[PDB]
Design an enzyme around this catalytic site. Structure first.
Site, mmCIF file in Angstrom:
data_model
loop_
_atom_site.group_PDB
_atom_site.id
_atom_site.type_symbol
_atom_site.label_atom_id
_atom_site.label_comp_id
_atom_site.label_asym_id
_atom_site.label_seq_id
_atom_site.Cartn_x
_atom_site.Cartn_y
_atom_site.Cartn_z
ATOM 1 N N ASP A 21 28.926 3.210 -84.219
ATOM 2 C CA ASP A 21 27.637 3.491 -83.921
ATOM 3 C C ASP A 21 26.985 4.568 -83.124
ATOM 4 O O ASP A 21 25.634 4.492 -82.928
ATOM 5 C CB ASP A 21 27.534 2.226 -83.041
ATOM 6 N N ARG A 35 22.028 6.407 -80.820
ATOM 7 C CA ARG A 35 22.606 5.152 -80.999
ATOM 8 C C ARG A 35 21.699 4.183 -82.037
ATOM 9 O O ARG A 35 20.481 4.268 -82.183
ATOM 10 C CB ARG A 35 22.195 4.327 -79.609
ATOM 11 N N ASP A 40 25.767 -3.236 -83.627
ATOM 12 C CA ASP A 40 27.190 -2.922 -82.861
ATOM 13 C C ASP A 40 28.313 -2.692 -83.515
ATOM 14 O O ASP A 40 28.614 -3.694 -84.385
ATOM 15 C CB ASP A 40 27.044 -4.129 -81.675
ATOM 16 N N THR A 41 29.061 -1.746 -83.242
ATOM 17 C CA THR A 41 30.591 -1.542 -83.884
ATOM 18 C C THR A 41 31.466 -2.025 -82.894
ATOM 19 O O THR A 41 31.587 -1.750 -81.776
ATOM 20 C CB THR A 41 30.578 -0.162 -84.179
ATOM 21 N N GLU A 43 33.833 -1.928 -80.353
ATOM 22 C CA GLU A 43 34.092 -0.855 -79.135
ATOM 23 C C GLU A 43 35.308 -0.326 -79.454
ATOM 24 O O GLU A 43 36.264 -0.541 -80.370
ATOM 25 C CB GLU A 43 34.531 -1.936 -78.005
ATOM 26 N N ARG A 87 20.402 8.353 -75.100
ATOM 27 C CA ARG A 87 20.850 8.107 -76.497
ATOM 28 C C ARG A 87 19.654 7.394 -77.332
ATOM 29 O O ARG A 87 19.505 6.242 -77.035
ATOM 30 C CB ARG A 87 22.170 7.228 -76.662
#
Ligand SMILES: Cc1cn([C@H]2C[C@H](OP(=O)(O)O)[C@@H](COP(=O)(O)O)O2)c(=O)[nH]c1=O
Ligand SMILES: [Ca+2]
Length: 141
Positions: A21, A35, A40-41, A43, A87
């Site tokens: 991400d 971003r 969402d990738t 973590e 970001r």
């Protein structure tokens, strides 16, 4: 908005990719990290957890894809240009390939943060996630 015709796509130069991400692009002379909007990738950092299944890899896609790319553009939504971090959030494009969606169509990401109205691409990545889930890709695996 002039003639643009909705959202505009700005060139940019790839600097360094962090994970699925997030990456640093030279959007209009000046280094900056970005971003991935609505996405969402798994973590990757922050101990506040550890390596989320499909994490390391989830980042072994955005990198190259950007590296193997000779050029890339960034698409600002209609909401905030950046989040409380510095970001910026956009669907960063790579050869017409929606990384955010690309990663989504791959089971390497989830649809997170749809923001109003900084989510002029909801449905799109939505149908994909359904396809990567109807078959069982990585996570949905
Ligand atoms: C993607 C996205 C993230 N954010 C913020 C909310 C999250 O805060 P918190 O970290 O305190 O939970 C963080 C998630 O981004 P990461 O996937 O890098 O963690 O970024 C937005 O405000 N709007 C966005 O569209
Ligand atoms: Ca993430």
């Amino acid at each position: 908005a002039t003639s643009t015709k909705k959202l505009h796509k700005e060139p940019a130069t790839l600097i360094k990719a962090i994970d699925g991400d997030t990456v640093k692009l030279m959007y209009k002379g000046q280094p900056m990290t970005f971003r991935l909007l609505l996405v969402d990738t798994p973590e990757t950092k922050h101990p506040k957890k550890g390596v989320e299944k499909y994490g390391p890899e989830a980042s072994a896609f955005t990198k190259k894809m950007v590296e193997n790319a000779k050029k890339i553009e960034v698409e600002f939504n209609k909401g905030q240009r950046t989040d409380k971090y510095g970001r910026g959030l956009a669907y960063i494009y790579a050869d017409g390939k929606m990384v955010n969606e690309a990663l989504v169509r791959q089971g390497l990401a989830k649809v997170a943060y749809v923001y109003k109205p900084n989510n002029t691409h909801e449905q799109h990545l939505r149908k994909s996630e359904a396809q990567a889930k109807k078959e069982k890709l990585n996570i949905w695996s």
